[PDB]
Amino acid sequence: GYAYARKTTDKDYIASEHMQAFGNTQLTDYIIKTVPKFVKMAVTGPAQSSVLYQEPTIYTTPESLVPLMVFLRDHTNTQFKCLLDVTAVDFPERAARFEVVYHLLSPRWNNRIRVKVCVDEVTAVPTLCKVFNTANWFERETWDMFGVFFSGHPDLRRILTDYGFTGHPLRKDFPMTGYQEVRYDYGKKRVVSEPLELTQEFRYFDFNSPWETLNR
Amino acid sequence: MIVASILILIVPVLLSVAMFTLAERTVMASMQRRFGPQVSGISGLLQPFWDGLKLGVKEPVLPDSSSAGAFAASPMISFVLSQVAWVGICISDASFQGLVIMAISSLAVYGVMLAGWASNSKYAFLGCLRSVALMVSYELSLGAALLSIGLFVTDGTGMKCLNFAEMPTTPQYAMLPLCLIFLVCILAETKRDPFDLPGYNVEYSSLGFALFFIAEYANMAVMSAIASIYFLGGFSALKITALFFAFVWTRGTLPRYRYDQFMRLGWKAFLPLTLAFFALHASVAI
Amino acid sequence: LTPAKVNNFTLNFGPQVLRLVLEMQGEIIMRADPHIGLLHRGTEKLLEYKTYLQGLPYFDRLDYVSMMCMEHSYVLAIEQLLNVSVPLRGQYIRVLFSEITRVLNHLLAITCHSMDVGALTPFLWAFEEREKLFEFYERVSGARMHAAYFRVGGVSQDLPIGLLRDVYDWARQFASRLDEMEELLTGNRIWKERTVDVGTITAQMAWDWGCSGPILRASGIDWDLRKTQPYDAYGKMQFNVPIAGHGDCYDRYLVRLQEMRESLRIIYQCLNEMPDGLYKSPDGKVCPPSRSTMKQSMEALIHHFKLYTEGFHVPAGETYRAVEAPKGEFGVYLVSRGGNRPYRCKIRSPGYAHLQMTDVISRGAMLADVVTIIGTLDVVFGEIDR
Amino acid sequence: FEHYLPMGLEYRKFSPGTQPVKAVVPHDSPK
Amino acid sequence: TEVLKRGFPGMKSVKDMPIVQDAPPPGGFPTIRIERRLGPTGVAIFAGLAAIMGYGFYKLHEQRQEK
Amino acid sequence: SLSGYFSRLLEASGKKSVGSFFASWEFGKMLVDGNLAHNVLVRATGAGRLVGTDYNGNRYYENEEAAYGRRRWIVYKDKFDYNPTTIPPEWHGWLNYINDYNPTNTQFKQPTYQIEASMTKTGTQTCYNPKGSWFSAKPRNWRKYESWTP
Amino acid sequence: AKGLEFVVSKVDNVVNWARAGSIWPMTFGLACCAVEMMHAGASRYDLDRYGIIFRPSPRQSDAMIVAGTLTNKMAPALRKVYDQMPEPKWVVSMGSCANGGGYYHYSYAVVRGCDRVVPVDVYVPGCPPTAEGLLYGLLQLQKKIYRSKTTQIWYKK
Amino acid sequence: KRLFGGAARHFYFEICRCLPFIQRLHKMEEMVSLKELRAIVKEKFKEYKDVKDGRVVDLLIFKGREEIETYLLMHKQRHHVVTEVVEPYYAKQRAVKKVTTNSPFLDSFLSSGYAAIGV
Amino acid sequence: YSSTLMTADKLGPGGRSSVSGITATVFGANGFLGSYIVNELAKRGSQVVCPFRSTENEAMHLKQMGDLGQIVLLPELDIRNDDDIKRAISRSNVIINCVGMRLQTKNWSFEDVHVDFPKRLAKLAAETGQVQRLIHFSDMGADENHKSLRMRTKAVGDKEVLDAFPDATIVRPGDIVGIEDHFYNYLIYQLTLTVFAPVVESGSNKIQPTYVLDVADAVAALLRKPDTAGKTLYLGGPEVLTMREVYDLLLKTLRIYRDDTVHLPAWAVKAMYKPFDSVRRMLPGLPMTSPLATEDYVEEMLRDKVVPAGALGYADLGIVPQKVTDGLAIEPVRHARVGGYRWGDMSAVAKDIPESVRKYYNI
Amino acid sequence: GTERRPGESGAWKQIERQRYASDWENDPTFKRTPKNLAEVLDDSASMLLLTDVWRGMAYTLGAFFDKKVTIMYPFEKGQLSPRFRGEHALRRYPTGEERCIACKLCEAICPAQAITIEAEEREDGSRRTTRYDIDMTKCIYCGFCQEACPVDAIVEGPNFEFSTETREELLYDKQKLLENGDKWETEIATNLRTESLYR
Ligand SMILES: NC(=O)C1=CN([C@@H]2O[C@H](COP(=O)(O)OP(=O)(O)OC[C@H]3O[C@@H](n4cnc5c(N)ncnc54)[C@H](OP(=O)(O)O)[C@@H]3O)[C@@H](O)[C@H]2O)C=CC1
Ligand code: SF4
Ligand code: SF4
Ligand code: SF4
C-alpha cells in the first residue's frame, strides 16, 4: 500500500523532477539493462498517463512473464502496484495470432506501463493471480472472448457469454451476428436457440478510398 | 344483534385501513415534495378501492409442490386474529381485556411462520424466522409494559383489573419513558421502520396479499388503540389518526436496523428497562 | 476432478440483473459467487464494424448514469493518436459538464444506496435536482441521457445563451438541497449502525484489488487523476480532496458527499471563468465544418461528404487513456491499424474491478449486508458487462 | 438556507427558442 | 467565408468580427456556499421530564386515595 | 369570491348554467377521473387568464405568478376522450416551454400543404400500415424483377 | 332482456375502470430505460398518482414493462417471470432495445425485440423514451383496457 | 500405454461417474437410463476422434469440464436438456429406416436451391 | 393446386424469417387445438389470419407466434354474419376451422355451431374460387346414428361440408392430450377436488387418445400431401385402452392411494345429470362446468371410440404417433405431482427411490 | 454528527475489539469520554430520548407543509429545447417539393442501419427517392442523420408521444414521414430559425 495522504496542504505539483525525468526518458533503458532476458522488444509509446510524455511497452515470452511482473510490482524504482487490466488482440495474419496485453499503474511515481506477450491458440499463459487478485476475472474474460488459456488458474470458466455458448465472439473470424438465434416456442413451451435468420440482412459499406496512404 | 355489532365494527376497520394505506402513501409524498395518488378519483379518493377490486379479479396461483391448505389459511388466520382483536377491543368485557389482546397479538406470529414454511422459498424461509424472532422478543417487553400499567388500573369497587372503561380519563405523565418504549415496541410489532428488514408473503398473490396487508394495518390500528387507551387517557378517533400520522412521520424519516442489531437492542436496552420500571412502579404503588 | 457429494446448503439470490450465489454456515456469509453476463451485449466486437463517429453512441450506454465521462476517455484516446489540441472554451465546457455528470452519478448512487438501506425520501428529493440537470442536458444536446455531445476536437454545438444563468441559479440552492439531504442520515444512529464497519477494505488490498474513485479515497490514499494526471482544464481548477481512513460504508458515503461539494466548487470556478472563443478544433479534415460554411464552400462540403461517410483515418498505433470517472477510473484501450475504423477497442470499467471484491469482502457478513455491499460498490452492469 | 423551486421569472425566464439577443457563434479562426 | 457570416457592411478587417456567445455577466457570478451548514440542555430536559413525571406521580397518589 | 369562481367555472367547462354543468355527464365522469376533475375545478379556477383557443376548441391559460414548469396549462374540449395529440403544433411549442410564441402574439407562415392536427388512430384498424401489410388496400410483392407469363 | 344487457355493459364499464386505474407493474432493471422509468415514478411525474405500484413479485404484477435490452442469456429468465404473471396480464415495450434490438440489433447475443419471446400490448419508442412518453404510453394502455368488454362477450357466449 | 496418456478415457470416465446425479437432479428417470446416456456422451466424444495435437485435446477436455460443470450447477435449465439431450435421442431412434428411396443429392435438389446449414 | 400451395412461393429454409407463401385463416384459433395449429403453420413462414370472439386478453398469446405482419387479429367475429368470414378469407387460399362446442347454450345450440356455420363457410369458400385447401375438424366418435346430439351434429356438418366443398379434407381425431386439453384436466378435476368419481357402467369402452403436436404435424403433412384433399383422416395413438385402464394409469400418475371412482348404471348417471341438462338453456353459461356431466358423454362411454378399420391415419402421413401414456406429453400432467419428490404417502413408488434410501428403510 | 461510539459499529470484529481494546480512544474521530455529570447527562440525552431522529422528523414534517413540484400531465407538460431529438421526419420546400435528394448521406452515417433507401431519376429528370424507410423500433434517435443532411431534409421533430399498440405501426415509410413533416413543419421551421445561429 502506498499513495497515503501525507501533506495537509494543496499540491500544485506532480511528482519530483529527477524521478519524472528518469521515468520519462531512461525508464525503458533501465528496464533493458536490468533484465535483458526478460526483454525481447521495446516500444516507448504515447504515454497512457499523460499526453505530453513518453511511456514504454514490453514484449516477452510467456515463460518469464511472472517473474517480470513480480519485479515490476516489487522493484524499488518500479512500484507498479496497480495492474489495470489484462486483454488480448487478434492478429490473424501472424503465426501467433494473439497479443495478450498487461497494463500497470504506479501511484508511487504517477507512471504507467504496458506489457505484451504474443502467443498462439495452443500455448498456455501462466496465471498472474498469485501476483494480482484482479487477474482472475480478467483472465476469465480473455479466455471467454478468445480462448486464451491460463495454466494453474483456480477455476477458468466463461463469464460473459451464454451458459451453453461455444466459441469466442471477439475473434476476428467470429461472425458479427453469429450462428444461432434464440426464440420461444409455444408448442414445446420452451425458449430454444435456432439457426440465425434476419428479416433484413446486414449491410457492409466499403468507404476505404483507393488513395489513402495511412492504410497499414 | 351480536353478529350485527361485529359487522358494524368490521366496516369502519376495512374502510379506514384502505384510507390508512392511501394516506400513508399521500403523506409520504407530501414529505417527499410530491403529490401522491391524485388521479384515481377525486383527489385520489378512490385508490385503495380499485386496488382491492383489482387484486380481487387477479388470478390466484398455487404452488404444486407444497401444502396449499396452509398457504390459504395463513392469511386467513391472520385476518381472523385481526377481527378477533378488534372485537375484543370494542365488544368485550373481560377482566383481563388487555391481557386478552396481548395473548391475541402473540398468535399473529404464526401466519408469517406458516407462510414461510409453506412456500418453497429459501429467503422466505429465513425472513419469516427473522420477523418471528423480532416480534417474539418484543412481546416480552410489551407484556412488561402492560404489567407496569396494571399496577394502577383499579375500578370503583376496589378490584384491580384490565377493563378499558375503568382506565383513567387522564394521560399518565408519570410513565413517559415506559410510554416511549411501548411505542417503539409497537413500531417493532408491525414490521415498520426501523424494523422493516423482513417479504415473507413474496410468493403470495391476490386477495391473500390483500388480507396480509389488511391484517398488518389492522394490527397497527389495534396497537394504536391500545396505546391511546393506556397512555393517552382514552379511546378516540383523533388519537388513532394522530398516532398513525406520527408513525408515517417516523417511517418516512428513518432507515431500518440490521437483524442482530435490533435483537441486541431489544434484549439489552428495552426489556431490562421495562423490568426496572415495573419494579419501581410496584414499589411506589405499595 | 471434482465431484458434488455434499449438497447441504444451497441458495439462489436473484435472477432479477445480478445473479448471486452465496454460501453460509448459517447466518454468516462464508462464500459469495456472482455470475454476470446477463447484460453482455458484445459491444467491443460491434465497435469494429463502426466508424469512430459511428461508435461514439456505444459509449453513451456503457454507463448510462454517467455519460460524458464515458465519452471523454474515448475522445481523448482518439485525439492523442490524432495529435489534436482542444480549444480552451471546449475544455471549460467539458470539465463543467463532467462535474455536473459526476454530481448526477453521486446523487443517484447515494439515493439508491439509501433506498436499499431503507430511506426513501432522499431518493425522491434528489431526483428533482437530477431532473433539473437533465433539463440542462436537453438544452445543450437535445437528449436527456444519451447526449453524444463530446466530439473529437471539441463538442457538437456551443452552449445556448442563458444556460449559465440557470446553472448558477441551480448552484445557489444545491448546497441547501445537499444539507437537507444529509440530516436524514448523517446524524442517525440507525444509518451508521447499518453502514459503520461493514465491508472494511485496506489500502494494500485495494491496490491489490484495483480500486478507483471514492473507494480508494476512503482508505487514506491520496489520489485523484484530476490532480496526478490532469486532462483538459482540470489542472487550472483548485479544489480539495476528501480523505477517510477506515474503508467503511459510512466513510464512502461521506467521501462521496464531500466529492459532491468539491464538484460544486469546480462548477462555480468554471462558471466564473468561461472564456470566449472557438469550441471546435480548427482542423476541418477531422472536425466537421459549420453548416453555413458547408453550404457556401466547396472544400467544406467535400470534407463534410467524406467525414460523414468514411471519416478520418487514424494513423496505425496503440494507446490507452483513462478518466477519473465518478465510479472510479474509466479507461479505453485503442488499437489502430491505419483505417477509418478502430481495429480493437478494449474497455476498462472500474465497477467490474470493484464487483470482484464481493467474495472476500462479504466473508463474515450477513445477508442484510450483501445489499449494502452492492449499493456501496456503486456498480453499473452496463460497463461491467459490455 | 435556500428554497427549491423558485417562482415565476426567477429561473429559466426565456424559452430557448426565444432568446432576446441574436447569437453570433464564430466558426473559424481569424488568423 | 466566415466574412460572409459574421462580417458587416464596410468591415475593414477580419479582426473586427464581433462574437456573441453564452458568457458570464460582467464581474462574474456571485459567491455560493459550499461547505456544510449546521440542542437543548440535558439538565433542562431532565428537569422538565422529572417535573412532568412527578406531577403524574402526585396525580396517581391522589387518585389512589380517591379510589 | 363565489360569483367569480362560478363565472370561471362556467367559462372553462363550456356550459351555460351551474344546473347545466352539475347535471351533465361530463360532471359525472369528473366524479370518476381525478385528473380531469382537478383540471375542471382547481387549476383552471385559480388566479390566471385565458390565452387563446385553437380550432379544436381547446383553451390555453397562463399564470405568471406560478412557479417555473407549472405556469401554462390547457383544457381539452373532448371531455371524455382527452388526448394530447389534438393540440396543434403552433401551440405545442408554447405548451412545451420550448418557445414564447403563440398564435395570439406570433403570426407564423402556413404552408399550403399543411395537415391539421387530430387524434391518434393507434389501436384501430384504420391506422397506418406498411405497404406489405395485410390491411393494405392492394398487397405488394416486392420482388425486384418480372416473372414471365405464358 | 335489454335491462340485463344494460347491466352487463355497466358492469363491464366498472371492471375496466378498476383494472385500468390499478395497474401494478414489475421492475426489470435491465438497462438505460429503467432510469427513465425510475424518474417516471419520481416527484415530477408521480406514477403513483396514476394508481401505479411496483411489486416485488410477479404474482401481484398486472403488466410488464421492458426497460432495457434483452440478451439470449436473460430471455429464459424473462419468460420465467412473465409466465409467473397471473391473468389478466399485459406487456409494455419501452425502448428500441426492447422494440427491435435497435443499436444492438446485429449483435450475436441480443434478442431482436422482446416480441420474439413474449407478446406485447404497448410499444413505447425512444432511446430512451421520455418519462412523459412512458406516461403517454401507459395512458394509451389504459385506453386499450377501456375498450375491453369481457362480460359482454360472456353473456352472448 | 495409450495415445497422449489416454486423457480422453479419463475424462469420459469422470463424466460417466458424474452422470447419474445429473439424471436424478434433472428428472430424466422417466426418459433415459444410465446406459443410453453414456452412449450419448460417447457419441459426443466421436466428433474429434481424429485430432493429432495433445494440446487441442487438453483444451477440448477443459471446455468439456466447463460444460459438465455448468451442467452440474443447474445453470442450464431443463430446456437445454430438452434441446440437446433427450429430444435428439428420440429423433435419432425415431426416424430410423426412413422410406425415402432418393439419393441425398436428389434430396438436396428437391429441398432447395442451396444446401441446408445449421441445426 | 396439387403441390403449388406448398412450393410456388416458398422462400427461405423454412424458419421464422422464411416465407412459405401460404395464406390461411383459422377459426377457433385461440382454442386449444387451433392455437397449436396456428403456431405450427406460422413457424414455417406462413401468413395466418386469426379472427376471434373471446377477449383480446385470451388472444394476446397468439400475437407472439408470428412475425411482423403475419399475425392478423380480427376482433368481434360474428359467426352469424358472413361479412366477417368473407373478409377473413379474402386473401387466404387455405381455410382451417376448429370452432367447436361441447355444451349447449341459450345463445348457441349444437346445430348452430356444428352444421349451419361450417356449411355457409364452405359455400363462401367455394364462392371465393382462390381457396385451395379447406380443413375441417370433427370427432372420432362422430356418427349419424348416435344418440349423442353433439356427435350427430358433427357428422351432419361433415357431410354438409363434403357436399358443399368436394375437395375439403376432414380430420376426425379422438382424445387429444395437452397442457390445457379438455380430456386430462377435467379428469383431474373429477379425481381431485371432488368427493366421488362416477364411471359409466363397466367403463370398458375402448378409446385411442392422441397428442396435439402429432395433430399439428399432421396438418402440415396434409397440406403437403395433395391426395388427402376431399378425404377423411382419423387420428389415434399407437395403443388401445379402456376408461378403467386410463383411470388406473392416471391414479398411478397421481399416486392416489384411494380409488374414488365408482361404476354406476347409465340411467343413474343420467338422473344425476338430468336436472342440470334441462336447465342448460335459458342460461348464459357457467364457468367450472365439466363437459362430462351430460347424457351425451354417457352415450359416448357406452361405445368404443377408436380409429375404424381401414381408415386413413397417421401412417398414411408417414407419421409415427408418439407415446401418450408416457413421454414428454406426460410431463405436464406429472406437474400436478411435480414429477414426485416428496409428495404423498406412497410406498409402492419404492421402485424408483434411490438405492441408499431403500436400505435405510430396509425393503 | 459524524462521530463514532462504542457499541455503534454494526460488526463483531470491531465491536469485540473496542469492548476488549481501547484502540478507538486513540482515534480522534470517536467522540471523547464525558468527564462530568453534565457531560454524562448530555450523553444520556443523546442516546436515550432519541434527539437524532427528532431533527429529521421535524425537517420531513416541514416538508409536509411545504410546496410541491408535481405536474398534471397531460394537461401540463415539461420544458424542452429546440435541439430536442424526437420523431424523424421528412421536410419539403415551401413550393411543395421534397428536400431529400437521395444523396444517401443519412443512410451512410446511420450507425443503426435503420435507414433503407432506394432511388432513381424522376420522370422530370429530378433525382428523387423511390423508397425511404426508417425503422423507429431500430432508430436510436441520435440525430446524426440530422447532422449529416446538407439540405435539412431529415429532421427529428418535436413529436415524442407516438407510441403504438403494434410494432408494425413503427415501420416508417416515405409516405408517413412526409405526412409527419407536413404536420410539424411550422414548429420545426421555427426551431431552425433559432438553431441556425448554432448549427
Ligand atoms: N380432444 C379434443 O379436444 C377434440 C377436439 N375436436 C375438435 O377440436 C376443436 C377444438 O378442440 P378444443 O380446442 O380442445 O376445444 P376448445 O373448446 O378448447 O376450442 C373452442 C374454440 O371454439 C370457439 N367457439 C365455439 N363456439 C363458438 C362460437 N359460437 N362463436 C365463436 N367461437 C366459438 C371458442 O371460442 P371462445 O374461446 O370465444 O369460446 C374456442 O376458440 C373443436 O372444434 C373440437 O370439436 C375433435 C375431437 C376431439
Ligand atoms: S433503448 Fe436506448 S436508452 Fe433504452 S435501454 Fe436500450 S440503449 Fe438504453
Ligand atoms: S434525407 Fe438528406 S441526407 Fe438522407 S438521402 Fe435525403 S437528402 Fe440525403
Ligand atoms: S436519428 Fe440516428 S438512429 Fe435515427 S435515423 Fe437519424 S442517424 Fe439513424
Coordinates of C-alpha atoms in Angstrom, one line a residue, chain G residues 7-152:
Chain G
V7 CA -76.4 -4.0 -16.5
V8 CA -73.8 -6.2 -18.3
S9 CA -72.5 -3.1 -20.1
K10 CA -72.3 -1.0 -16.9
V11 CA -70.5 -3.9 -15.1
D12 CA -68.0 -4.1 -17.9
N13 CA -67.5 -0.3 -17.6
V14 CA -66.8 -0.7 -13.9
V15 CA -64.5 -3.7 -14.4
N16 CA -62.5 -1.7 -17.0
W17 CA -62.4 1.3 -14.6
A18 CA -61.0 -0.9 -11.8
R19 CA -58.5 -2.8 -13.9
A20 CA -57.1 0.3 -15.7
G21 CA -56.7 2.5 -12.7
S22 CA -54.8 0.0 -10.6
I23 CA -52.1 -1.5 -12.8
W24 CA -49.2 -2.7 -10.8
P25 CA -46.1 -3.5 -12.9
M26 CA -42.9 -5.4 -12.1
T27 CA -39.4 -3.9 -12.1
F28 CA -36.9 -5.3 -14.6
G29 CA -33.9 -3.0 -14.0
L30 CA -32.4 -4.2 -17.3
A31 CA -30.6 -1.1 -18.8
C32 CA -30.9 2.6 -19.7
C33 CA -34.7 2.8 -19.9
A34 CA -35.0 1.8 -16.2
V35 CA -33.5 5.2 -15.2
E36 CA -36.3 7.0 -17.2
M37 CA -38.7 4.5 -15.6
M38 CA -37.3 5.3 -12.1
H39 CA -37.7 9.0 -12.8
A40 CA -41.2 8.4 -14.1
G41 CA -42.3 7.3 -10.6
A42 CA -40.4 10.3 -9.0
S43 CA -41.9 13.5 -7.7
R44 CA -42.1 15.4 -11.0
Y45 CA -44.2 12.7 -12.8
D46 CA -45.6 10.6 -9.9
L47 CA -46.5 7.3 -11.5
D48 CA -48.1 6.6 -8.1
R49 CA -50.6 9.3 -8.9
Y50 CA -52.0 7.1 -11.7
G51 CA -52.5 4.1 -9.5
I52 CA -49.2 2.5 -10.3
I53 CA -47.3 0.5 -7.7
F54 CA -44.2 -1.6 -8.4
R55 CA -44.4 -5.0 -6.7
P56 CA -41.5 -7.4 -5.8
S57 CA -43.4 -10.4 -7.2
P58 CA -45.0 -11.3 -10.5
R59 CA -47.9 -12.7 -8.5
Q60 CA -49.2 -9.3 -7.8
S61 CA -47.9 -7.8 -11.0
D62 CA -50.5 -6.7 -13.5
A63 CA -48.4 -5.9 -16.6
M64 CA -44.7 -6.0 -17.6
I65 CA -42.7 -3.0 -18.9
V66 CA -39.4 -4.0 -20.5
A67 CA -37.0 -1.2 -19.7
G68 CA -33.6 -2.2 -21.2
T69 CA -32.0 -4.6 -23.6
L70 CA -32.7 -8.3 -23.5
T71 CA -30.0 -10.9 -24.0
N72 CA -30.2 -14.5 -25.0
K73 CA -28.9 -15.5 -21.6
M74 CA -31.7 -13.3 -20.0
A75 CA -34.5 -14.4 -22.3
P76 CA -35.4 -17.7 -20.4
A77 CA -35.5 -15.8 -17.1
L78 CA -37.7 -13.1 -18.6
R79 CA -40.1 -15.8 -19.9
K80 CA -39.9 -17.4 -16.5
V81 CA -41.1 -14.2 -14.8
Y82 CA -43.7 -13.4 -17.4
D83 CA -45.0 -17.0 -17.1
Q84 CA -45.3 -16.3 -13.4
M85 CA -47.6 -13.3 -14.1
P86 CA -51.2 -14.1 -13.3
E87 CA -54.2 -13.3 -15.6
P88 CA -55.3 -10.9 -16.8
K89 CA -51.9 -9.6 -17.9
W90 CA -50.3 -7.2 -20.4
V91 CA -46.8 -6.3 -21.6
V92 CA -45.4 -2.8 -22.4
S93 CA -42.4 -2.4 -24.7
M94 CA -40.3 0.6 -23.9
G95 CA -37.1 1.4 -25.7
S96 CA -35.7 0.4 -29.1
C97 CA -33.6 -2.3 -27.4
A98 CA -36.9 -3.8 -26.3
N99 CA -38.6 -2.8 -29.5
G100 CA -36.5 -4.5 -32.2
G101 CA -32.9 -4.5 -31.0
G102 CA -32.0 -1.0 -32.1
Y103 CA -28.4 -0.2 -31.6
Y104 CA -27.5 -3.9 -30.8
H105 CA -29.8 -5.4 -33.4
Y106 CA -26.9 -7.2 -35.2
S107 CA -25.3 -8.5 -32.1
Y108 CA -24.9 -12.2 -31.6
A109 CA -26.3 -12.4 -28.0
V110 CA -29.2 -9.8 -28.2
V111 CA -32.8 -10.9 -28.6
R112 CA -34.0 -8.7 -31.5
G113 CA -37.0 -7.3 -29.7
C114 CA -38.8 -8.8 -26.7
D115 CA -41.6 -9.6 -29.1
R116 CA -39.8 -12.8 -30.1
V117 CA -40.2 -14.2 -26.6
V118 CA -43.4 -12.7 -25.1
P119 CA -46.4 -10.9 -26.6
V120 CA -46.5 -7.1 -26.2
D121 CA -49.6 -4.8 -25.9
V122 CA -47.9 -1.4 -25.9
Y123 CA -44.7 -0.3 -27.8
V124 CA -43.1 2.8 -26.4
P125 CA -40.4 4.2 -28.8
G126 CA -37.3 6.2 -27.8
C127 CA -33.7 5.5 -26.9
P128 CA -34.5 6.3 -24.2
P129 CA -38.1 7.4 -24.4
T130 CA -39.2 10.3 -22.3
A131 CA -40.7 9.6 -18.9
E132 CA -43.5 11.8 -20.3
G133 CA -43.6 9.4 -23.3
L134 CA -43.9 6.5 -20.9
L135 CA -46.8 8.3 -19.2
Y136 CA -48.5 8.7 -22.6
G137 CA -47.9 5.0 -23.5
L138 CA -49.3 3.8 -20.2
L139 CA -52.3 6.1 -20.7
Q140 CA -52.8 4.5 -24.1
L141 CA -52.6 1.2 -22.4
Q142 CA -55.4 2.4 -20.1
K143 CA -57.3 3.4 -23.3
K144 CA -56.9 -0.1 -24.7
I145 CA -58.1 -1.6 -21.4
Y146 CA -61.2 0.8 -21.6
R147 CA -62.4 -0.7 -24.9
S148 CA -62.3 -4.2 -23.4
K149 CA -65.7 -5.8 -22.8
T150 CA -65.5 -9.2 -21.2
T151 CA -68.9 -9.9 -19.6
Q152 CA -70.5 -8.5 -22.7

